[PDB]
Design a protein around this nucleic acid. Structure first.
Lengths: 161, 161, 161, 161
DNA sequence: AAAAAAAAA
DNA sequence: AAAAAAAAA
DNA sequence: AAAAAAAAA
DNA sequence: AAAAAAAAA
């Protein structure tokens, strides 16, 4: 069944959570197994209400694909990347919701700012959660993501006994 | 049985697929186990027919050995490597078919071009599939290959319980 | 049950031991599993009495969290980090005991000094164990810690079969 | 039982083989498990007799400890390391046999020379096998050794389920 | 709740 | 066949 | 369908 | 014996 062991970062204005969603497989009728829906690294952002307390119900999600992960783990100190996602893509509700994840170095080079933006043209809202991430914390993600990458790709199945 | 979870890259003129083929073992009569045929990282190239559609039947293969993998994961941004293979080697049909895989950085340093060339003197054909690969994508291969390397070498068997 | 395979470094004035403490989980009533208490990399320091012999009973501990680990594995040759811990935190006995772990490069760049300081205002004691660590040894920790990081985070549970 | 999957390099004058020997454990009477004898990365050198053929019976061994491994995987392009071993150490036959492993970059920086020297004062012999190693091959060892390091340390036992 | 799609045993 | 030793549940 | 070979318990 | 806490299925 499910497993809940997210790496989390709690800061002044918002919280960040990251955990792997494994790929789904389909047992073929040839006997073997085929990778079906792809795994990701899910990112959850949510706001801090009141004093050191976080409103879990106003949360927004961002699914990192294998390639977006590779883009992140290969980031240099002075590098920055930005990903743009439409949840309801190739679907009926396209163009309506627009997510954009940005990773930028801060002035000091003492880390990055990781912010999620969500623009919903249906509900007429504009949300933005930003979380500062230190070098040590981003080292955690880098390493944890690297480790997780083969698994979300399904490559952990290629095992000798 | 078999497992199908290839990392794939689909571009304008062709598609690239990479997946590990595990080594085969032979149970000795001493009780232990001996590595027999070696594992590789198989690369499959195939052409794009019509509009965003790929002719799976005109595909060519290239098997990366452990050492060729190590050559790839240790490539710098400005580096390039070229591998040359004869499928029917030390065999009757040698010199007939000639494969050459090249990995070159593009001008921008924004990635590499990965091309497969196949020259068949029997069928009198000359094929060449090239796929551009971004930094993020090549980061995926680098990481996925690194992870896979111990497995195709059989070293995943050396495990404490 | 428990497992005892610490990486150890024995030097002139003191000994250093490092081993992973895995996270604890709670099986939810939803069926799945939830990470409970977090894993760490435990560091044990203890003094050398007499000639090449070490007083196991005067030992002090320091628990590295995931983020402190990431801080360590991302250290450059010329880098240094210092962690400050209060064992009895958010508790009744706070402010009483104070631990500080320092990792500093030595002049030669031939490694680091890893020292633990413990100031106990209850028992009125002031302890300090320092252990020199070569590049090769610190390479061992770096690698061993990197490997261990996903496990103490609970991410080794995200596995395809 | 035993497992035989060595990474091997065959060159003009000699052959090199590398494979992990796992640590031995002792089940305590407390229930848990304790690491006993330490694992290593065994290196086997042997001479080439005649034309492309190798005299398996004149082979010499060198056991890499965890720390020696860390020294090797942290080697730069222009770096070189030398290890010195006495097989019959803290024993009756000490000082008699003397092994020295050297890893040096070649002029081109196109790899290293890995040579084993064995001086036996009992049998009055002086042996020396050298094997050139390319960047790609040394990348294989680096990666394969890194992967193996946690295992020979016993850290592969710290696993969540 | 999650950006999807292209080959195929 | 292998460089070993130091604490300890 | 795949570049192979060299030692050996 | 260990620096803890914040959401939640």
């Amino acid at each position: 069944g499910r497993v809940f062991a997210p790496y989390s970062v709690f800061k002044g204005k918002a919280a960040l959570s990251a955990e792997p969603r494994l790929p789904t497989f389909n047992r073929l009728d040839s006997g073997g197994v085929k990778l079906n829906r792809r795994g990701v690294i899910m990112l959850t952002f949510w706001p801090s209400v009141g004093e050191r307390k976080y409103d879990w119900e106003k949360r927004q999600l961002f699914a990192l694909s294998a390639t977006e992960v590779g883009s992140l783990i290969s980031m240099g100190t002075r590098d920055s990347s930005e990903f743009f996602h439409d949840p309801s893509m190739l679907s009926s509700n396209a163009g309506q919701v627009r997510k954009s994840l940005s990773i930028k170095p801060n002035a000091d080079g003492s880390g990055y700012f990781i912010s999620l933006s969500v623009v919903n043209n249906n509900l007429k809202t504009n949300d933005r959660f930003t979380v500062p991430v230190t070098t040590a914390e981003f080292a955690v993600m880098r390493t944890a993501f690297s480790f997780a990458l083969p698994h979300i790709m399904g490559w952990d199945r290629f095992t000798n006994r």
